[PDB]
Write a protein that binds this DNA or RNA. Structure first.
Lengths: 135, 38, 140, 188, 169
RNA sequence: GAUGUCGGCUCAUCACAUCCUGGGGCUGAAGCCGGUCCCAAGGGUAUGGCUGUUCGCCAUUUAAAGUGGUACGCGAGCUGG
RNA sequence: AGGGAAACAACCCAGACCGCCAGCUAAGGUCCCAAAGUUGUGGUUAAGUGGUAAACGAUGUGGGAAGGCUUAGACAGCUAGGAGGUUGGCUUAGAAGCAGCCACCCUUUAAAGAAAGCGUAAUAGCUCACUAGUCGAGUCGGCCUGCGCGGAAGAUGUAAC
């Protein structure tokens, strides 16, 4: 998975996920990209699962940019646990996703192979995504 | 028949038909690509 | 007009008179009889006569026969490698024959690098990728 | 390159949202260092066909508001971040004596004949297109040639390593920022 | 192009009855073909027969085409004897009933209605003759489900074509 | 200012995500067998040794010994291990 | 409190001083239970959607933008198709256009892929671009959007208008 090397604190708040993704919406490194069109939450093994789908469906070369980064820690109360005995401990990591956030980018492939590779990538992600080219 | 929630044309001989409100697939080659609803 | 591909040609080469290796093939295209068999005039001794290997043809109605810039027969002439003639039983399944690209200087007299590729090392890739799809491959 | 324009005597948020959802239009402005700015409505369908062109942004665009016609360079563009379509267009006046910075694409001409590709196994990595320039409107590069033919494996082409066509000032070279244009490197 | 604007081109030996709402086709080698032609349909006359719709629907666009097809095989069945050659194992044709012992302990007897007729031109074969292709194909299907084609060795009653999926174990 | 447990007995009632029986499709289904998936709830759907057992493990049967809801059905019906 | 949301402290409208067999409105409504439009104009929708719902899957249908294939006669359907060395490759009952291990232009001159794969688990049969004489033409592939269709199985009785 992708995790930070160390963070300043261990628990964040829950927070909210509002707005559109104005920053992070351009294909800034690659030629083709997998942009999200709905807001949600990618859990760093969704991210790695779609990553492996991409890097396994290319088979020949290319360069894949993984743009999202899970830096938000998410906790959990275990089972048979009464509520309110301090905040529960960290389990996994999460990138907060807004509509427009470019998730993955590729160059070095054809447009058809890129499109049917981001189809494999989008099959593993709980978001509504789309396919964009460089403007 | 093969009941899914996603029928597709598995080969080139497959052919998608709306029959009686059901999205079926008929294959003129292999009856294992016959599939019922989706 | 008539529009389709993966057209399927096989007869004994040169003479179209023996029919029942195929027999009544057509009944869709609609051309005449007098229009294949006058261009047997100039050149033998180059491109493997008689054995069933097809031209895969396109048609026009000018009738003064036309040959391409092409001397590569490539479809139905390459089962035998040791001298035995028939075909493979079922693909990928019956592993009994051990096969790579070893002995080629018998044919590498006339490699003919013009109609294969851009240079000679890519002509190694063509013979490294020629017959490799019913029971052989190339590492060596 | 010609787009048709209008007058736009009504400005704001809900006004702009009504232009986009009811009238099918797109707001814009025209401005230069020599005249007042002027707000303009355009059509989304009529500017989205310009944006289809590869030489859209590095080119003279005639622009007709009434019977008044202006020469116009598109120097800004706003775009809906999720769906992706033009909101307000934000373009610039063009005068014949003016410095006129625009973005020009890179075009990466002969990549099959690359000595880090054919003999040595490697792939071309374009890190940058859309170079910003600084040029009079007389010389507008619709493209900038990037020759990638005599470049070996592991070698990098920078902004100094290519051509500035007939008085075109590449902006980052005028600083100490010699950016990496393209790249030839080993595969994965 | 679309098929309802393709005219019928009936021969001289099809003496039709225009009635305004339903067509009634008579002739030699079979006759008495009546069809209640639907409301969204036009039946006009010339030296040949032809069809057109009435209103801008996608439902009648299928109906004019099927009405041309129904009268096409109706006319050409009033003219010619619609056939089928079903190949089977063992056929003792005797009369208006058919007798066949398809691998069971009982020979299942199949009777033939008015219209259709079955013959015994060979040892393993049935030729059918009828005036509408509807009932010809229906009685061919009614023979066919007595014993469908087993793939492995190959038994049962077939059609005239050979597209039967065969497998080996 | 009381809605008295688990199990067994007795009596049930519904669902269907069907255990048998019935009808099919595909098959890597030659046939006896199967595997899986549809359709179907009409009727059926063990006796025991151990332990308080539910369960479980065995023994022997059956065409089969289905899965669940009903105050984990049922003590103003019984028991009380 | 009253009216509406079937029933429903807290939701909507509205704050009951008392009487009236007077009127006008709010929310919500106007086919019958049940008071008021079986009102008008233009559409959409065939699921009883309305009147339960997600990933995803569908020639369901309405609308609006665009491309090229568009009569020198297109998208599926009838009257030739079919080579000028050689055994073009570690294999020896049998390794051509689907094995662990891959693929781009020199003929006699109007003709065309050393193959994206179903055949007689394989040989001797045969479905995909046609530089055309031939039937005579208006159709094919994606985007945005309206409403719909499957995905959708439970227990006393229709039983989520």
């Amino acid at each position: 998975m992708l995790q930070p090397k160390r963070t300043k604190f261990r628990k964040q708040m829950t927070g909210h996920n509002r707005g559109l993704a104005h920053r992070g919406s351009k294909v800034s490194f690659g030629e083709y990209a997998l942009k999200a069109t709905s807001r949600g939450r990618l859990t760093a093994r969704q991210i790695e699962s779609a990553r492996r789908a991409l890097t396994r469906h290319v088979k020949r070369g290319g360069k894949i940019w993984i743009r999202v980064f899970p830096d938000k820690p998410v906790t959990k109360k275990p089972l048979e646990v009464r509520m309110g005995k301090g905040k529960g401990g960290v389990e996994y990591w999460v990138a907060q996703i807004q509509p427009g956030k470019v998730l993955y980018e590729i160059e070095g492939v054809s447009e058809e192979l890129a499109r049917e590779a981001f189809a494999l990538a989008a099959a593993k992600l709980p978001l509504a995504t789309s396919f964009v080219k460089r403007t | 028949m093969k009941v899914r929630a996603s029928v597709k044309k598995l080969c080139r001989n497959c052919k998608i038909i709306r029959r009686d409100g059901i999205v079926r697939v008929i294959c003129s080659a292999e009856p294992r690509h016959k599939q019922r609803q989706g | 007009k008539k529009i389709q591909a993966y057209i399927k040609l096989q007869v004994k080469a040169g003479q179209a008179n023996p029919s029942p290796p195929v027999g009544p093939a057509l009944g869709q295209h609609g051309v005449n009889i007098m229009e294949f068999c006058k261009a047997f005039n100039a050149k033998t001794q180059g491109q493997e006569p008689g054995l069933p290997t097809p031209v895969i043809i396109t048609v026009y109605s000018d009738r003064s026969f036309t040959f391409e810039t092409k001397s590569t027969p490539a479809a139905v002439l390459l089962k035998k490698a040791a001298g035995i003639t028939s075909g493979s039983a079922r693909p990928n399944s019956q592993k009994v024959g051990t096969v790579t690209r070893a002995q080629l200087e018998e044919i590498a007299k006339t490699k003919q690098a013009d109609l294969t590729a851009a240079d000679l090392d890519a002509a190694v890739r063509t013979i490294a990728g020629s017959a490799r799809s019913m029971g052989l491959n190339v590492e060596g | 390159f010609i787009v048709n324009a209008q007058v736009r005597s009504d400005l704001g948020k809900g006004a702009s949202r009504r232009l986009r959802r009811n009238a099918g239009l797109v707001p814009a402005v025209v401005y230069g260092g020599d005249k007042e700015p002027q707000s303009v409505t355009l059509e989304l369908r009529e500017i989205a066909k310009l944006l289809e062109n590869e030489a859209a942004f590095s080119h003279v665009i005639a622009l007709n508001v009434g019977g008044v016609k202006e020469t116009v360079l598109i120097k800004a563009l706003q775009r809906h971040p999720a769906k992706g379509f033009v909101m307000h267009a934000d373009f610039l006046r063009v005068v014949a004596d003016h410095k006129l910075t625009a973005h020009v694409p890179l075009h990466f001409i002969n990549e099959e004949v690359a000595v880090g590709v054919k003999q040595a196994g490697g792939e071309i990595s374009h890190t940058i297109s859309e170079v910003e320039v600084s040029c009079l409107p007389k010389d507008l590069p619709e493209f900038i040639e990037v020759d990638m033919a005599k470049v070996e494996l592991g070698q990098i082409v920078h902004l100094s390593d290519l051509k500035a066509p007939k008085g075109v000032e590449l902006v980052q070279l005028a600083h100490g920022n010699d950016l990496a244009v393209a790249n030839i490197h080993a595969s994965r | 192009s679309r098929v309802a604007k393709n005219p019928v081109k009936l021969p001289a030996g099809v003496e039709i009855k225009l009635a305004g709402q339903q067509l009634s086709i008579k002739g030699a080698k079979g006759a008495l073909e009546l069809k209640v032609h639907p409301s969204v349909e036009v039946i006009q006359d010339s030296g040949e027969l032809r069809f057109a719709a009435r209103n801008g629907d996608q439902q009648t666009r299928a109906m004019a085409g099927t009405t041309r097809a129904l009268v096409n095989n109706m006319v050409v069945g009033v003219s010619q004897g619609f056939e089928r050659k079903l190949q089977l194992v063992g056929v003792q044709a005797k009369g208006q009933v058919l007798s066949l012992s398809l691998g069971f302990s009982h020979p299942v007897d199949y009777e033939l209605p008015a219209g259709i007729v079955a013959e015994t031109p060979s040892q393993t074969d049935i030729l059918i003759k009828g005036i509408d292709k509807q009932l010809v194909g229906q009685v061919a299907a009614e023979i066919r489900d007595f014993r469908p084609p087993e793939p492995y060795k190959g038994k049962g009653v077939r059609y005239a074509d050979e597209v039967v999926r065969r497998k080996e174990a």
